[PDB]
Amino acid sequence: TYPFDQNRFVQYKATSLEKQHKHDLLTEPDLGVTIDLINPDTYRIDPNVLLDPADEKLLEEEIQRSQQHAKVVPWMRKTEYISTEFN
Amino acid sequence: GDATPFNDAVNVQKISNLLSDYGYHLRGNEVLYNGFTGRKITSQIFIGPTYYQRLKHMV
Amino acid sequence: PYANQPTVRITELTDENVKFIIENTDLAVANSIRRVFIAEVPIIAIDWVQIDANSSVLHDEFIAHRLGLIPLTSDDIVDKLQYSRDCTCEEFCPECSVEFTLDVRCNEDQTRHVTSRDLISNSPRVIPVTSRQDDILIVKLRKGQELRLRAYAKKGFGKEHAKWNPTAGVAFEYDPDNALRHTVYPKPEEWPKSEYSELDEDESQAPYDPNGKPERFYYNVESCGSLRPETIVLSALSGLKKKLSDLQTQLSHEIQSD
Amino acid sequence: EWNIVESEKALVAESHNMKNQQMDPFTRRQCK
Amino acid sequence: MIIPVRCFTCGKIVGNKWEAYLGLLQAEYTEGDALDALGLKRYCCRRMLLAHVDLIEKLLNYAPLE
Amino acid sequence: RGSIEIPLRDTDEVIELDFDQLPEGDEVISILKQEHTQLHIWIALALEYYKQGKTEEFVKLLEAARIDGNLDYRDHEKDQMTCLDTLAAYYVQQARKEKNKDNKKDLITQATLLYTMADKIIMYDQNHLLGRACFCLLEGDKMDQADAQFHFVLNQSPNNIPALLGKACISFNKKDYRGALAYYKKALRTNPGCPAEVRLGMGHCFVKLNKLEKARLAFSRALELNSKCVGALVGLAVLELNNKEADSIKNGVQLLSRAYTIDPSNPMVLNHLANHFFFKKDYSKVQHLALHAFHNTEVEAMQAESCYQLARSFHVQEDYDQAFQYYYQATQFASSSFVLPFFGLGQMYIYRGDKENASQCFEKVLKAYPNNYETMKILGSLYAASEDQEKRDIAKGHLKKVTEQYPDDVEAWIELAQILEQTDIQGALSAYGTATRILQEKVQADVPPEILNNVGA
Numbered sequence: 001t002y003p004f005d006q007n008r009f010v011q012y013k014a015t016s017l018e019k020q021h022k023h024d025l026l027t028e029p030d031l032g033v034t035i036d037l038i039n040p041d042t043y044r045i046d047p048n049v050l051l052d053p054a055d056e057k058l059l060e061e062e063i064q065r066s067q068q069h070a071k072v073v074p075w076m077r078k079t080e081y082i083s084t085e086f087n
Numbered sequence: 088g089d090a091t092p093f094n095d096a097v098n099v100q101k102i103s104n105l106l107s108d109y110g111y112h113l114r115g116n117e118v119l120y121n122g123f124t125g126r127k128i129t130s131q132i133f134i135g136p137t138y139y140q141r142l143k144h145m146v
Numbered sequence: 147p148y149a150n151q152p153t154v155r156i157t158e159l160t161d162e163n164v165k166f167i168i169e170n171t172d173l174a175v176a177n178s179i180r181r182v183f184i185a186e187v188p189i190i191a192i193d194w195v196q197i198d199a200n201s202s203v204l205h206d207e208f209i210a211h212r213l214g215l216i217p218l219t220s221d222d223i224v225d226k227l228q229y230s231r232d233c234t235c236e237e238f239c240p241e242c243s244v245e246f247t248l249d250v251r252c253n254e255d256q257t258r259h260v261t262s263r264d265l266i267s268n269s270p271r272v273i274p275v276t277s278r279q280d281d282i283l284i285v286k287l288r289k290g291q292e293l294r295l296r297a298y299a300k301k302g303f304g305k306e307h308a309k310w311n312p313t314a315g316v317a318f319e320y321d322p323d324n325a326l327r328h329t330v331y332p333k334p335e336e337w338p339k340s341e342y343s344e345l346d347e348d349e350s351q352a353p354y355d356p357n358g359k360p361e362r363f364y365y366n367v368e369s370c371g372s373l374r375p376e377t378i379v380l381s382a383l384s385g386l387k388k389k390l391s392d393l394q395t396q397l398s399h400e401i402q403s404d
Numbered sequence: 405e406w407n408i409v410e411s412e413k414a415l416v417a418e419s420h421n422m423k424n425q426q427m428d429p430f431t432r433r434q435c436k
Numbered sequence: 437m438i439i440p441v442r443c444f445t446c447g448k449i450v451g452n453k454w455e456a457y458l459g460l461l462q463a464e465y466t467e468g469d470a471l472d473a474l475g476l477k478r479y480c481c482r483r484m485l486l487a488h489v490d491l492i493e494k495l496l497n498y499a500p501l502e
Numbered sequence: 503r504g505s506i507e508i509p510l511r512d513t514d515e516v517i518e519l520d521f522d523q524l525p526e527g528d529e530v531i532s533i534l535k536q537e538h539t540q541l542h543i544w545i546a547l548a549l550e551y552y553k554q555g556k557t558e559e560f561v562k563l564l565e566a567a568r569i570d571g572n573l574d575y576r577d578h579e580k581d582q583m584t585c586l587d588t589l590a591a592y593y594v595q596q597a598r599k600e601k602n603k604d605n606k607k608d609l610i611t612q613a614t615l616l617y618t619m620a621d622k623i624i625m626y627d628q629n630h631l632l633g634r635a636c637f638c639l640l641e642g643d644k645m646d647q648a649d650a651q652f653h654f655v656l657n658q659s660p661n662n663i664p665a666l667l668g669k670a671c672i673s674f675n676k677k678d679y680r681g682a683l684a685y686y687k688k689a690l691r692t693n694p695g696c697p698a699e700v701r702l703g704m705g706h707c708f709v710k711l712n713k714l715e716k717a718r719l720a721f722s723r724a725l726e727l728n729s730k731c732v733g734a735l736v737g738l739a740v741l742e743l744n745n746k747e748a749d750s751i752k753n754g755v756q757l758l759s760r761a762y763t764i765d766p767s768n769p770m771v772l773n774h775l776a777n778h779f780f781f782k783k784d785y786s787k788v789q790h791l792a793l794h795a796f797h798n799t800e801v802e803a804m805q806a807e808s809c810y811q812l813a814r815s816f817h818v819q820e821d822y823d824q825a826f827q828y829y830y831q832a833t834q835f836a837s838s839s840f841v842l843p844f845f846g847l848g849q850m851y852i853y854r855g856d857k858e859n860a861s862q863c864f865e866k867v868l869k870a871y872p873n874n875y876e877t878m879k880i881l882g883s884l885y886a887a888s889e890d891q892e893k894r895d896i897a898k899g900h901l902k903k904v905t906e907q908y909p910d911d912v913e914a915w916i917e918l919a920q921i922l923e924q925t926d927i928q929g930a931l932s933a934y935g936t937a938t939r940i941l942q943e944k945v946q947a948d949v950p951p952e953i954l955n956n957v958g959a
């Protein structure tokens with residue numbers, strides 16, 4: 001046999017695997033939001049609400065393509081129809 | 088499209104690379120199902136829009 | 147010695163098209179249903195045009211032809227009507243037709259867009275597709291030109307004239323990956339992937355599967371608006387089933403009478 | 405008007421695409 | 437003469453889309469986005485609006501009366 | 503507000519006391535009971551004690567209010583139930599942030615006794631179902647029961663946002679982010695009053711399903727409103743840990759040194775400061791912070807990683823005795839968390855010649871995903887010798903992964919030919935041919951006799 005080295009340490013190292021791990025945010029079992037109905041001392045229900053376009057975008061789930069229609073392509077023109085004003 | 092005769096900015100590789108951006112076979116070929124049986128034709132048919140003329144010689 | 151037991155899986159359902167998957171069926175059954183969606187599902191369409199006054203720039207039959215191709219809302223009514231050729235009436239019946247009426251005169255100075263708005267139906271349900279987006283342009287009239295006609299819509303199916311075809315386009319597909327080698331690519335990597343391809347971006351086509359049938363037929367039935375895209379399907383299954391029932395009847399007569 | 409705009413901003417691409425003249429399928433005469 | 441009612445190939449209604457298509461060319465669109473915004477996916481239906489020459493506009497100049 | 507009037511027996515509403523100073527909560531129960539003040543001023547003064555940032559006086563002054571329910575208030579039972587509602591909801595709210603002198607059950611048993619007495623006057627109200635639903639989150643069971651009790655608040659009188667928010671936390675526990683995301687939308691439209699940044703839980707579900715453009719946008723607003731919240735800042739640290747070659751200063755200073763000085767009792771920022779210092783070869787603080795990141799946490803997700811950091815810092819120091827027990831606790835606490843604890847016990851079981859169990863623990867590494875580093879682990883600790891296809895098949899499939907890729911392979915071709923001597927004799931020869939020349943590029947080193955002897959064999 002060949003005396004292969006026993007992998008008793010880390011020398012690759014495993015830095016490529018530990019940094020890619022997405023650790024979940026479990027700071028509070030209620031997902032960082034207190035579930036209660038007594039604490040809401042203050043309110044923002046009155047007209048001309050405190051809100052921002054940054055907040056507005058966050059209300060949607062998923063809304064956020066084929067961009068090549070508007071390519072130059074020097075060998076491709078545009079179309080022409082029937083006016084009532086010409087030579 | 089532009090089909091001027093002697094253009095040389097137009098060739099078939101160039102058209103082909105364009106064609107392949109729309110999700111087609113680069114050469115204009117397609118995979119046809121047979122209309123009677125529904126089975127794929129083992130040959131890939133060349134298919135695309137071409138301008139056709141009706142001539143005055145009706146039967 | 148008996149039938150296979152198919153399973154259905156609707157992937158996409160809109161008011162314009164249906165995407166569904168049929169599993170565990172023969173290639174022939176899966177295609178014959180496609181033929182029936184196109185040619186053998188009934189719809190209501192204009193098929194009789196009586197032109198009273200036509201002063202437009204087009205012909206007489208041009209008007210009538212364009213009226214033929216306008217889709218009519220059929221779902222609730224089409225499985226009630228007699229075919230025209232089967233109604234006892236000496237002319238037309240509400241049981242065998244829906245009556246239409248176009249009366250348009252350009253009086254104003256501007257040009258008149260004769261649209262499907264102008265087609266006035268006697269039945270409130272069998273209208274052109276206006277309910278809930280512009281309208282099918284029939285003609286354009288000038289200052290003093292007009293168009294008066296009455297029209298009738300009857301039941302028919304796409305085997306007669308394309309006007310009775312309920313579909314935009316039926317997208318049939320099977321075996322997205324070339325597993326059967328039903329098709330033989332000269333260069334299998336020049337080929338883009340199917341919508342349905344259960345394949346990675348490394349390999350080009352599935353490995354050859356010697357013993358194996360088509361299943362998993364991928365459909366994309368697109369309505370012309372004349373029916374709901376999911377009614378086209380229930381109707382075609384019922385149409386094909388009805389042709390076979392009829393066939394069996396005729397068969398049984400042939401058998402016992404020999 | 406937009407075809408005038410389109411055709412001038414497109415054909416300058418034959419001056420800008422300077423790095424890769426390589427592809428085959430086109431020829432031209434070179435006499436004497 | 438006048439935009440067909442249906443794509444000859446597939447059968448999709450394109451008859452209602454011509455005014456809208458010219459309206460999307462009153463906006464600054466490429467024809468490729470005009471066709472897309474109207475929802476014409478197939479290269480059959482897309483030919484109908486690209487290729488339609490509107491001659492009814494010229495025939496309308498030949499007034500009968502007034 | 504800050505100076506309210508207290509009713510008296512003669513010429514009431516003439517005395518006011520300032521709320522800026524911090525008085526004793528023992529004399530308040532007497533001054534409100536010698537003059538026979540109405541029940542409304544009790545809750546009115548309680549909220550002003552909670553406005554100053556004091557969670558203890560608000561729950562202690564309202565405890566003695568059960569005795570003086572209806573003495574002479576002429577049928578004032580409605581305000582009494584509203585008082586006891588706080589003693590049935592703030593107990594469960596304070597049980598999660600327990601101190602070091604109290605336990606969990608010490609606040610659970612007080613939240614269960616007075617809740618039955620709260621339902622004697624009015625039952626099944628706007629907030630009474632909130633207590634029954636949140637009772638299940640504290641024990642970790644009966645998830646369907648808590649969701650069915652939260653749905654009842656929409657059909658009785660849903661006059662608040664958090665009235666509905668409770669179902670999304672239960673949808674989150676069953677790994678349903680589609681059902682939770684839809685319910686978190688309603689949270690932002692009203693923009694309700696909550697010091698907890700209700701947007702925080704929304705930004706937590708934006709982490710999944712590849713919405714990195716969304717989660718940042720959630721955290722940012724949260725940071726602008728109140729910088730006191732660390733739950734909006736450490737998330738961006740976890741969103742930025744993947745970039746190890748780019749944006750390192752923001753990830754060790756702006757996202758790790760700021761969250762630590764503002765809130766040092768957090769095991770998440772302590773775990774992340776430890777693993778960041780581990781790459782900089784500063785092990786003197788990793789083991790100091792990981793002991794403090796371990797004793798204050800309760801859920802099994804943070805403690806398995808805190809033990810894993812300790813055994814990783816002990817492994818690199820040739821200290822496997824203390825690190826072996828930490829690697830076992832990392833898998834005994836939380837096994838389905840990540841693949842790291844299974845791989846640490848695999849490389850650990852190599853010690854003391856107990857490499858039998860390293861194969862059993864390394865088997866669960868492939869079930870998630872293979873790795874170019876895990877393939878050589880079982881190949882080195884391969885117990886397959888001959889006519890043993892239960893263990894030689896894994897070595898062949900591991901060797902096919904190192905054969906294609908080139909992570910400076912030096913002994914990979916030796917282990918290739920060491921299996922192929924029983925199989926086709928040309929395969930071992932092809933591996934020795936390339937293994938003979940691969941041992942010459944690093945240095946001028948002659949080939950050891952053990953390879954030339956076997957290639958000639």
Ligand SMILES: [Zn+2]
Pocket residue numbers: 228230233234235237238239240241242243
């Ligand atoms: Zn009739």
Ligand SMILES: [Zn+2]
Pocket residue numbers: 443444445446447448478479480481482
């Ligand atoms: Zn078409």
